[PDB]
Structure 1
Amino acid sequence: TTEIHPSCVTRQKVIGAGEFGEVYKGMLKEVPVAIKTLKAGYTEKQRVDFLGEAGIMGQFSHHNIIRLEGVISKYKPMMIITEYMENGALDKFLREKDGEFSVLQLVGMLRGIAAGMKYLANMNYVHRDLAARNILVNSNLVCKVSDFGLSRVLEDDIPIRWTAPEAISYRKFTSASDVWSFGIVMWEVMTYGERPYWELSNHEVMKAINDGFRLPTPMDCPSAIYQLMMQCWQQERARRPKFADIVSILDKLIRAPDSLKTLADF
């Protein structure tokens, strides 16, 4: 990974924060960047996880995967420097822009996410935490997968209601469990950031899914899109589409956009 000298980086505005560091908007010398820091006194595990995220991101080069500019590791606090995504997290963005996009734009966002996920899957990377909150959006409406590492635990044991049944029941996370999650993201995007399963508890969601229930059709959702998200939610992993299938299908729909005028019954 590229080692960046601190004189080349200015932090301007905090845009995110946690117990162990913050995320800033800043400039890199001059281009806008995001800057994630690690606080002094970090543990060995913290360092491995922090620099681990940068190491994973630095292995990737794809339009729909957040681009690493480099790291500051020789000076402290340590920093990861990425491209700056002007519209922030997809979940919050959709909820602040409810109804403001065409169906074709929404489907385009999903194709981008699916292309990023295909690339990760093919690169032997299982995300485990695919959700609108972990996707970022630039000023071209390009959606990029973020949130990399191995630093994660399933809630009550990573939220349950985004996770595939096999990952919950026996800890089997694969690209096919990411496809399940992608189905949930599809529903997030087509609903402008509705919370999956609304106020159902985690245990009610699991029981509902095990009994065959699935999320209902979003309002004004193309039939083909709802059909695709339902296939992502097949109980049997081998019946789910691969990302390659999802990319292919979304591409065809986008290239024949009249196909999106046929709506699922709400």
Structure 2
Amino acid sequence: QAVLKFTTEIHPSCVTRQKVIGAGEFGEVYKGMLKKEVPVAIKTLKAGYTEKQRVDFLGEAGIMGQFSHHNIIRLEGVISKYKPMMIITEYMENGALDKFLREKDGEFSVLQLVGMLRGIAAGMKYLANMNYVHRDLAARNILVNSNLVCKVSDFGLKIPIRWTAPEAISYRKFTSASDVWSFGIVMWEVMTYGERPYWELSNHEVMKAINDGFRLPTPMDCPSAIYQLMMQCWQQERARRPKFADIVSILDKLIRAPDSLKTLADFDPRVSIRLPS
């Protein structure tokens, strides 16, 4: 019971499952309603789950209840006393950030995009300081609310190679510093409205390019300071990367002195259009 110390136990009569929207480790994820009524996402642990699955499922519920931060998905509660067991979270209206960006190409101001990134960074700083290494930080794992607030989540699946730091790929060293690398990729995803990192390079081509010193080029219309910051997230030497504390501080200062974002990094045009004279 102590694992659930930060969670609220929800009675099953409060929950209505409506539509399957995903899979858990041993069960489905549903959109549903929770009693006023509010929409929720509901992850179940169905009959037949193993001991390890139960420990991991209740452990997930417990840590999610512990997290209380504006930029982390909110746990409404847990059903642990009845079967199927359930983890119940808020339901974001705008869905996942990657799809959202791609469906809203060019619709936001630079300040709005940078504000998104500040929120993601604040959530990640909180996770890191709570001793939680995400390991799968990517725009697909971030939800967006109707105030444009980004909420770090984890929707499950092995290694998303092109979001993952070299040391995590090479020797399985996952830390908050490998999450910083991933955050740099997320910065690039946001500023490009959901372009796929490294385009059609294979996983092996990405790893070879990184090891040889190549890095993603600047997004179009990207503030110089923002490109500089994402580039420092991609230092090979893990110790040279900013901490999330540094990232949050820098993004907050840029937003609060917004003229700092008017200077743009040079975009390298991959195609040349010459209007004849």
TM-score band by shorter chain is over 0.9
**Contact 1:127–1:148 under 8 Å retained in 2:** no
Displacement after TM superposition at 1:20 (Å): 3.2
Secondary structure in 1 matching 2:154: coil
CA shift, 1:145, in A, is 0.8
SS in 2 for 1:4: coil
Residue 32 of structure 1, CA deviation: 2.1
Question: What is the rounded CA distance, in whole Å, between the counterparts of 2:204 and 2:247 in structure 1?
Answer: 29
- CA drift of 1:92 comes to 1.1
Q: CA deviation at 1:148?
A: 7.8
**Aligned-pair distance for 1:263?**
0.8
Confirm or deny: 8 A CA contact 1:130 1:162 kept in the other structure: yes
Q: Does 1:7 align with 2:13?
A: yes
Mapped to 2, the partners of 1:131 and 1:50 lie a distance apart of 22
Structure 1 position 18, deviation (Å)? 5.4
Give 3-state SS (helix, strand or coil) of 2:82's partner: coil
Deviates more, 1:9-18 or 1:70-79: 9-18
Report the TM-score when normalising by structure 1. Answer: 0.93
2:221–2:265 contact (8 Å) kept in structure 1: yes
Task: List per-residue Cα deviations over 1:151-200 (Å, max 9, x = no partner).
Answer: xxxxxxx2111111111111111111110000000000001111111111
Work out whether residues 141 and 155 of structure 2, in 8 Å CA contact, stay in contact via their aligned partners in 1: no
Stretch moving more, 50-59 or 63-72: 50-59
1:131-210 paired onto structure 2 within 5 Å: 131-147=138-154, 158-210=159-211
Q: Does the 8 A contact of 1:57 with 1:148 survive in 2?
A: no
What is the alpha-carbon distance in structure 2 between the residues aligned to residue 162 and residue 13 of structure 1?
30
Distance 1:10 1:229 in 2: 42
1:219 is paired with a residue whose SS is: coil
Q: Deviations over 1:224-243 (max 9, x none)?
A: 00000000001111111110
1:175/1:250 CA distance change after superposition, 3 Å: same
CA offset at residue 15 of structure 1? 2.8
Q: Aligned partners of 1:178, 1:148: CA distance in 2, in Å?
A: 16
Q: CA deviation at 1:11?
A: 1.8
- TM-score where L is the length of structure 2: 0.89
- CA offset at residue 19 of structure 1? 7.1
Between 1:39-48 and 1:77-86, the stretch displaced more is 39-48
Secondary structure at 2:143's aligned position in 1? strand
Q: Deviations over 1:18-62 (max 9, x none)?
A: 573222222226222221122221122222222221111111111
Show structure 1 runs of 4+ deviating over 4 A.
none
- Root mean square deviation of aligned Cα: 1.5
Structure 2 residue runs of 5 or longer lacking an equivalent are 1-6, 268-277
CA distance in 2, matches of 1:94, 1:32: 23
C-alpha contact 1:135 1:144 (8 A) present in aligned 2:
yes
Matched residues in 2 for 1:13 and 1:2: separation?
Answer: 23
| Cα displacement (A) at 1:2 | 1.2
Segment drifting more, 222-231 vs 31-40: 31-40
The number of residues matched between the two structures is 258
CA–CA separation in structure 1 for the residues paired with 2:155 and 2:107? 30
Q: Secondary structure at the match of 2:30?
A: strand
Q: Which runs of 5+ in 1 are unaligned?
A: 150-157
What is the CA–CA distance in structure 1 between the aligned matches of 2:116 and 2:17, rounded to whole Å? 29
Contact 2:121–2:248 (8 Å) recurs in 1: yes
State whether residues 56 and 148 of structure 1, in contact with CA within 8 Å, keep that contact through their aligned partners in structure 2. no
- Mean CA deviation greater in 256-265 or 24-33: 24-33
